[PDB]
Design a protein around this motif. Structure first.
Motif, mmCIF file in Angstrom:
data_model
loop_
_atom_site.group_PDB
_atom_site.id
_atom_site.type_symbol
_atom_site.label_atom_id
_atom_site.label_comp_id
_atom_site.label_asym_id
_atom_site.label_seq_id
_atom_site.Cartn_x
_atom_site.Cartn_y
_atom_site.Cartn_z
ATOM 1 N N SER A 32 -10.590 -16.038 6.264
ATOM 2 C CA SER A 32 -10.073 -15.071 7.257
ATOM 3 C C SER A 32 -10.408 -13.629 6.871
ATOM 4 O O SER A 32 -10.793 -13.363 5.745
ATOM 5 N N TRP A 33 -10.247 -12.714 7.819
ATOM 6 C CA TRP A 33 -10.477 -11.281 7.594
ATOM 7 C C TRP A 33 -9.273 -10.640 6.905
ATOM 8 O O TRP A 33 -8.122 -10.835 7.330
ATOM 9 N N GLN A 34 -9.550 -9.882 5.849
ATOM 10 C CA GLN A 34 -8.509 -9.167 5.128
ATOM 11 C C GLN A 34 -8.630 -7.678 5.380
ATOM 12 O O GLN A 34 -9.708 -7.111 5.273
ATOM 13 N N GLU A 35 -7.519 -7.041 5.717
ATOM 14 C CA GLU A 35 -7.511 -5.603 5.940
ATOM 15 C C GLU A 35 -7.296 -5.050 4.548
ATOM 16 O O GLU A 35 -6.356 -5.476 3.841
ATOM 17 N N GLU A 36 -8.149 -4.119 4.136
ATOM 18 C CA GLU A 36 -8.011 -3.525 2.807
ATOM 19 C C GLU A 36 -7.989 -2.010 2.932
ATOM 20 O O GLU A 36 -8.942 -1.426 3.449
ATOM 21 N N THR B 142 -8.682 1.719 6.427
ATOM 22 C CA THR B 142 -8.784 0.267 6.319
ATOM 23 C C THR B 142 -10.214 -0.239 6.582
ATOM 24 O O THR B 142 -10.884 0.106 7.594
ATOM 25 N N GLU C 236 -19.657 -9.542 12.023
ATOM 26 C CA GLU C 236 -18.433 -10.262 11.716
ATOM 27 C C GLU C 236 -18.468 -11.588 12.444
ATOM 28 O O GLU C 236 -17.980 -12.570 11.919
ATOM 29 N N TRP D 259 -14.371 -10.234 4.688
ATOM 30 C CA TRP D 259 -14.153 -11.661 4.839
ATOM 31 C C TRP D 259 -13.716 -12.268 3.539
ATOM 32 O O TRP D 259 -14.440 -12.210 2.534
ATOM 33 N N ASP D 260 -12.536 -12.857 3.534
ATOM 34 C CA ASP D 260 -12.076 -13.534 2.338
ATOM 35 C C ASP D 260 -12.551 -14.983 2.522
ATOM 36 O O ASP D 260 -12.032 -15.731 3.393
ATOM 37 N N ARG E 190 -12.087 -3.863 6.930
ATOM 38 C CA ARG E 190 -11.938 -5.332 6.864
ATOM 39 C C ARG E 190 -13.100 -5.980 6.111
ATOM 40 O O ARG E 190 -14.278 -5.518 6.222
#
Lengths: 336, 336
Positions: A241-245, A231, A105, A235-236, A233
């Motif tokens: 930024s990092w997106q929690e999915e 969740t 990351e 990278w968008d 994470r």
């Protein structure tokens, strides 16, 4: 240095690869390949042929070995990605371990800051233990190999980074793994059930009674531990930024078509893996699972551990087409 | 029966193969292939993938597994040859062990007595010990794999039986091997130097100091033990009798071009085999040997023995072309 000698040996043995120095990493000799998404992974040495044996057409564009069971530092990842960037983005495949997530990351942000379009796919297929020794969530193991091949085929045919990334996250939610060890890489006639590729404890230590019975237990665990919400994470790259999915796995079920990987963790005789496969086919047939393709061999190891893992990955006709696509790497080779 | 399960597993994993029963043997699913010389081998189980993993296009037509470290009975060999016979003869590759020679030799006579044109090639590549426990002469080991591929290519392109047999005997005189074990399938930090694939003793037991030092000793031995003169019988199908043929090997020397096979005898991590390959390349370069191609992996094992062997086979342009020719088997796959 032994690690140095091992990588020099890999390089000398495979002219399709280029070993770089300062910092150390490996790429396809023809990288960067213009116009295709570039695929990269890495992790600690000690799991050979993962990931260097997977560098080549239809699979990884390159990989970043670290010291034994230790993540490569971010500089190696950044420089390897810059070297393979074909102008269409680089996709980072990362196994779910504390060290790997941190370093990959970090490289991801450095890449982003340098203008490289990057995104990530996290692998957490090990169904055995939630929150082991070096993992937040489930451990990333042999399904990583199946994902590299499938996403590698998709990148090679020309899919976009977004397409390669969504396919990898989808496969991740459909692939389930479990491993056992009969000996580390500590009690006679006992096995570590649900062991990790770094030697992490499993669900428990239990008696080994027979091959068939061990497979039955492993298979049963794959069927009942499949359900999973968590969740992951990613990278968008548009928002930088990092997106929690939240990501969801359904249990394997009657009617699923699968790819099976019977994987030697290190010192299991190949004759035994065929016996494993024999029992596994019987159990899938009984549970309504159709094995459509298989891989049986040493594909994700843990040094010289004595044990093996079973991986089942749900697939459909499109995924099977990506499976059958050409791959040319040290460890996996097939043509049209 | 575990062997039964293991063979059923191999068969279920590879639709390109057919497992037969009464008696047990394995063939290419497309055999008999009309108009091509058929190639067969066999031996005790416990050396997987040798020989069943070498059944396919460009290599074996079929193979006859026996029980662990035990030769198949002559009925298995006879029926397998009858199943793959394509009308152009059957070539039997036999590793040099008392039991294998006797059973394959008995099958050869039964085949001849039934109208099948057949001939033999004996493999005796292990330079370490003359007259070990199960062998008159030198033991047949990993070079068997390289010979099956090369002779397999010659047969696949249509060469005659005599041309395939001559090539096999020639290669046998040009291939040299040695193995070491750090553990049986003993002592501490000690190795059995010049070990056999059935656990036979080597030249001696000696201290393991390092990987590089072990490779140096193995390589020195290949250089100094290369010269060999001995009798190998072969089936003369025109006379219908065994012919005693004095055969000669020259030591490897400066100027030779070789194919190198670094082979895991069972439990040696792939990372370590690359370190072995790295030291081997340096020693070959110093000695004046050019390695033109290599194979690094588990190709001729001894159950879960901890150790590895090195094989060097002298080749020329014609032989290198047969190496590069297409092969499609469980263990070896390439199209160029």
């Amino acid at each position: 240095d032994v690690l140095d000698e091992q990588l020099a040996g890999l390089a000398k043995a495979h002219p399709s690869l280029t070993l770089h120095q300062d910092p150390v990493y490996v790429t396809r000799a023809d990288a960067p390949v213009a116009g295709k998404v570039a695929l990269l992974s890495g992790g600690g040495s000690g799991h050979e042929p993962m990931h260097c044996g997977y560098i080549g057409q239809g699979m990884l564009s390159g990989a970043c070995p670290g010291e034994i069971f230790t993540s490569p530092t971010p500089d190696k990842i950044f420089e390897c990605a810059m070297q393979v960037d074909g102008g269409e983005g680089v996709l980072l495949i990362i196994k779910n371990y504390t060290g790997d997530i941190l370093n990959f990351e970090t490289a991801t942000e450095l890449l982003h800051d340098s203008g490289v379009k990057v995104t990530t796919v996290v692998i957490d297929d090990d169904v055995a233990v939630k929150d082991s020794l070096y993992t937040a969530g489930r451990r990333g193991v042999a399904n990583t190999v199946l994902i590299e091949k499938l996403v590698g085929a998709a990148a090679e045919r020309g899919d976009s980074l977004d397409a390669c990334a969504e396919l990898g996250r989808k496969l991740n939610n459909q692939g389930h793994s479990i491993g056992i060890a009969l000996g580390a890489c500590l009690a006679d006639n006992e096995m570590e059930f649900g062991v990790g590729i770094h030697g992490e404890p499993g669900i428990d230590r239990r008696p080994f009674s027979s091959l068939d019975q061990t497979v039955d237990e492993m298979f049963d665990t794959l069927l009942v531990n499949g359900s999973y919400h968590r969740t992951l994470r990613f990278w968008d790259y548009q928002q930088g930024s990092w997106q929690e999915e939240q990501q969801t796995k359904q249990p394997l079920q009657s009617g699923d078509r699968v790819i099976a990987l019977v994987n030697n963790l290190g010192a299991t005789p190949l004759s035994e893996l065929y016996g494993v496969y024999n029992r596994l086919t019987t159990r899938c047939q009984q549970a309504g699972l159709t094995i459509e393709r298989n891989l049986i061999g040493a594909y994700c190891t843990s040094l010289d551990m004595t044990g093996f893992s079973i991986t089942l990955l749900k697939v459909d006709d499109e995924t099977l087409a990506l499976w059958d696509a050409p791959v040319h790497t040290p460890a996996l080779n097939w043509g049209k």
